[PDB]
Design an enzyme around this catalytic site. Structure first.
Site, short mmCIF file in Angstrom:
data_model
loop_
_atom_site.label_atom_id
_atom_site.label_comp_id
_atom_site.label_asym_id
_atom_site.label_seq_id
_atom_site.Cartn_x
_atom_site.Cartn_y
_atom_site.Cartn_z
N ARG A 31 -1.99 -7.63 8.96
CA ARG A 31 -2.01 -6.29 9.52
C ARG A 31 -0.75 -5.54 9.13
O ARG A 31 0.33 -6.13 9.05
CB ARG A 31 -2.11 -6.37 11.05
N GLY A 32 -0.91 -4.26 8.88
CA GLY A 32 0.21 -3.38 8.69
C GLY A 32 0.22 -2.33 9.76
O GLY A 32 -0.54 -2.39 10.73
N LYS A 33 1.09 -1.33 9.60
CA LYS A 33 1.22 -0.30 10.62
C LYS A 33 -0.10 0.44 10.84
O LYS A 33 -0.44 0.78 11.97
CB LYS A 33 2.33 0.67 10.22
N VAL A 83 -6.21 -6.20 6.94
CA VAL A 83 -6.86 -6.73 5.74
C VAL A 83 -7.59 -8.02 6.06
O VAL A 83 -7.01 -8.93 6.67
CB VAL A 83 -5.84 -6.96 4.60
N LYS A 121 -9.77 -3.66 3.54
CA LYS A 121 -8.63 -3.07 4.22
C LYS A 121 -9.13 -1.93 5.11
O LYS A 121 -9.52 -0.88 4.60
CB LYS A 121 -7.63 -2.57 3.19
N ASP A 131 6.77 1.20 -2.81
CA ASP A 131 6.81 0.00 -1.96
C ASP A 131 6.74 -1.27 -2.80
O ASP A 131 6.07 -2.23 -2.43
CB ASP A 131 5.70 0.05 -0.91
O1 LIG Z 1 -3.44 -3.02 0.55
C1 LIG Z 1 -3.90 -3.38 -0.56
O2 LIG Z 1 -3.97 -2.62 -1.57
C2 LIG Z 1 -4.33 -4.81 -0.75
C3 LIG Z 1 -5.17 -5.13 -1.82
C4 LIG Z 1 -5.56 -6.44 -2.05
C5 LIG Z 1 -5.07 -7.47 -1.22
C6 LIG Z 1 -4.25 -7.13 -0.15
C7 LIG Z 1 -3.88 -5.81 0.10
N1 LIG Z 1 -3.73 -8.08 0.68
C8 LIG Z 1 -4.08 -9.35 0.54
N2 LIG Z 1 -3.53 -10.36 1.37
C9 LIG Z 1 -2.70 -10.17 2.53
C10 LIG Z 1 -1.86 -11.19 2.90
C11 LIG Z 1 -1.09 -11.10 4.04
C12 LIG Z 1 -1.14 -9.96 4.80
C13 LIG Z 1 -1.99 -8.94 4.42
CL1 LIG Z 1 -2.08 -7.47 5.39
C14 LIG Z 1 -2.78 -9.03 3.29
C15 LIG Z 1 -4.96 -9.77 -0.49
C16 LIG Z 1 -5.37 -11.10 -0.63
C17 LIG Z 1 -6.19 -11.47 -1.67
N3 LIG Z 1 -6.64 -10.57 -2.54
C18 LIG Z 1 -6.30 -9.29 -2.42
C19 LIG Z 1 -5.44 -8.84 -1.40
#
Ligand SMILES: O=C(O)c1ccc2c(c1)nc(Nc1cccc(Cl)c1)c1ccncc12
Ligand SMILES: [Cl-]
Ligand SMILES: [Cl-]
Length: 328
Positions: free
Chosen positions: A42-44, A48, A63, A151
């Site tokens: 999670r973000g602000k 996801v 997301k 970022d």
């Molecule tokens: O925001 C995007 O563009 C974005 C786009 C793709 C991923 C993502 C966030 N975050 C991932 N993982 C993740 C791991 C820890 C915390 C969070 Cl919030 C997310 C992730 C995993 C596997 N494949 C694609 C993604």
């Protein structure tokens, strides 16, 4: 009066619709086609999940965007549209909504990444060159498309170390560059904030991302992650100044007529500029070379205008072994 050395006018040379994201009207598909399988984090303003597209069995991530943030949603969507097909940019597969609540979500390709804390302690010299080159492709691409990521940090540089895949993710802070525009300095993670942000200089550009990249390079070659580990934004600049030097900071401020918050007077001290070789020791010496230090020295500069562009960095001799392997 600062502007980017590259791609300065590129948005003004495009149709207004390219950059006028507030006018963008996404096509929202149906989230019911995706089955959520695991929460990743999670973000602000987002959350996801790993998911499966039930119509083709493809693994993706979803997301979900806190729906109140309408302008910021259009911004991220339009940016991702504009970056379609870009090298090493995370692929946006679709823009969807829960068909009842209308809450919007972005569907991205799935990357099976190796978390960076573990990965960065096993990288070889060639690995660092390779992955930095691949990240530079993504930044040169988005900069050429008129977009600052704002970022860049290890979490946002997903690396599948088995398939040798890299994706730059999380475009939620990204913005369009327009000459002379003043931007919000409340971007990037503390440890990756350029000095311009830390001194409240709003007329920044793509070169912010090159500072962040330099911070990542330093952490990889020296095995100190994060490299500049401030306790708050003030201390972050102190940590930078203890390496790059205080007289050198003051010359940067003077050049751009930057006012320095007086709280810094009591904490900056007086610091010489340090030689980059000072960070070498037996645990990292196999990752450090003259060419790595020359590149790093040209990225971690106070003066954002004097930092290498992503292209200039890609052209540096440090990456010649990668280019040679990518052609042979
Ligand atoms: O925001 C995007 O563009 C974005 C786009 C793709 C991923 C993502 C966030 N975050 C991932 N993982 C993740 C791991 C820890 C915390 C969070 Cl919030 C997310 C992730 C995993 C596997 N494949 C694609 C993604
Ligand atoms: Cl902004
Ligand atoms: Cl230090």
């Amino acid at each position: 009066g600062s502007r980017a050395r590259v791609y300065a006018e590129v948005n003004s040379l495009r149709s207004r619709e390219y950059w006028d994201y507030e006018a963008h009207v996404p096509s929202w598909g149906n989230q019911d086609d995706y089955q959520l399988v695991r929460k990743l984090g999670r973000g602000k303003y987002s959350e996801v999940f790993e998911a499966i597209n039930i119509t083709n069995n493809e693994r993706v991530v979803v997301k979900i965007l806190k729906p109140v943030k309408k302008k910021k949603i259009k911004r991220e969507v339009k940016i991702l549209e504009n970056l379609r097909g870009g090298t090493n940019i995370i692929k946006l597969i679709d823009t969807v909504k829960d068909p009842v609540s209308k809450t919007p979500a972005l569907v991205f390709e799935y990357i099976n990444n190796t978390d960076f804390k573990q990965l960065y302690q096993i990288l070889t010299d060639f690995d660092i060159r390779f992955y930095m080159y691949e990240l530079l492709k993504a930044l040169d691409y988005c900069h050429s498309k008129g977009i600052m990521h704002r970022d860049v940090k290890p979490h946002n540089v997903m690396i599948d170390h088995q398939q040798k895949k890299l994706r730059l993710i999380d475009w939620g802070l990204a913005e369009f560059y327009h000459p002379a525009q003043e931007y919000n300095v409340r971007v990037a993670s503390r440890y990756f904030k350029g000095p311009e942000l830390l001194v409240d200089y709003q007329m920044y550009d793509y070169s912010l991302d090159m500072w962040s990249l330099g911070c990542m390079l330093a952490s990889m070659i020296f095995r100190r992650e994060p490299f500049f580990h401030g306790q708050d934004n003030y201390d972050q600049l102190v940590r930078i100044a203890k390496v790059l030097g205080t007289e050198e900071l003051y010359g940067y401020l003077k050049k751009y007529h930057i006012d320095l918050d007086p709280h810094f007077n009591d904490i900056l001290g007086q610091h010489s500029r340090k030689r980059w070789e000072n960070f070498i020791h037996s645990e990292n010496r196999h990752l450090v070379s003259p060419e790595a230090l020359d590149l790093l020295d040209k990225l971690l500069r106070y003066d954002h205008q004097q930092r290498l562009t992503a292209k200039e960095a890609m052209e540096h001799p440090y990456f010649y072994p990668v280019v040679k392997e990518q052609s042979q």
